[PDB]
């Protein structure tokens, strides 16, 4: 699956355009998860963080989540609860992969929990760097 000389494999965290011209976080998944069909040549199935919906997108239209500050949209983040929720689940997956530790209390708001997570992301995901984001 996805053996085509194009970028991104199953499990890769990426940004994709949807809901307008905004970049939204997602993860490349196997077509098996979509209930559809195998992706067309050069394309990938991605599951959007937050709503968990699926989209078939060309590998040439996706960017690595690692280009974080480049695609994160602060205005959108502040305006939409859905974007903030998407970001939380995205960075939750990111920190699990990279071994980055965060702490929280039951009930702590998503925005509050996101503060240190975004600092880590915008800072370049140190100490691992974007390598720590790999599946």
Please indicate, yes or no, whether residues 89 and 127 belong to a single structural domain of this protein. Answer: yes
Residue 50: half-sphere exposure toward Cβ, Cα within 13 Å: 18
115 and 90 share a domain?
Answer: yes
Q: What is the DSSP letter of 80?
A: -
Q: What is the CATH number of the domain that holds 13?
A: 2.30.30.140
Whole-number Å distance between alpha carbons of 22 and 15: 9
19 and 77 belong to one structural domain: no
Say what the resolution is, in angstroms: 1.8
Q: 122 and 86 in one domain?
A: yes
- Rounded to the nearest 5 degrees, what angle is found at the Cα of 14, between the Cα atoms of 13 and 17? 150
Which CATH number characterizes residue 118's domain? 1.10.720.50
Tell me the H-state helices in the chain.
68-71, 74-79, 81-98, 110-122
Whether residues 15 and 43 fall in one domain? yes
The single residue listed with the structure tokens 């480049």 is: 70
Tokens coding 71? 């695609």
The residues, any chain, with a CB within 8 Å of residue 86's CB and separated by 6 or more, are 24, 25, 48, 49, 50, 51
Method by which the model was determined: X-ray
Q: Rounded to an integer, what distance in angstroms lies between the CA atom of residue 65 and that of residue 44? A: 15
3-state helix, strand, coil in the chain (%, to 5): 40, 20, 40
d(CA 94, CA 90): 6
Q: What is the spatial distance between Cα 100 and Cα 128, in angstroms, rounded to a whole number?
A: 9
Q: How many domains does the chain have?
A: 2
| Residue located via tokens 């098996």 | 32
Domain of residue 23, residue span: 1-65
Checking 35-42 for CB contacts under 8 A at 24+ apart, the result is: 38/1, 39/1, 39/2, 41/4, 42/4, 42/6
**Are both 83 and 116 inside the same structural domain?**
yes
Do residues 88 and 104 make contact, with C-beta atoms less than 8 angstroms apart?
Answer: no
How many residues in total does the chain contain?
135
Whether residue 107 sits in one domain with residue 54: no
How far apart CA 35 and CA 103 sit, in angstroms, is 36
Q: Are residues 17 and 59 in the same domain?
A: yes
Residues 130 and 77 in one domain: yes
How far is 130 from 135, CA to CA, in rounded Å?
11
């Amino acid at each position: 699956e996805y053996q085509d000389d194009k970028e991104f494999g199953i499990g890769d965290l990426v940004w994709g355009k949807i809901k307008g011209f905004s970049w939204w976080p997602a993860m490349v998944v196997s077509w098996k998860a979509t209930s559809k069909r195998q992706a067309m040549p050069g394309m990938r199935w991605v599951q959007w963080f937050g709503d968990g919906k699926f989209s078939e997108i060309s590998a040439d239209k996706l960017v690595a989540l690692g280009l974080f500050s480049q695609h994160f949209n602060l205005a959108t983040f502040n305006k939409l609860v859905s974007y903030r929720k998407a970001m939380y689940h995205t960075l939750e997956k990111a920190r699990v992969r990279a071994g980055k530790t965060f702490s929280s209390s039951p009930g702590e708001s998503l925005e509050d929990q996101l503060k240190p997570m975004l600092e880590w992301a915008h800072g370049g995901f140190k100490p691992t760097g974007i390598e720590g984001l790999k599946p």
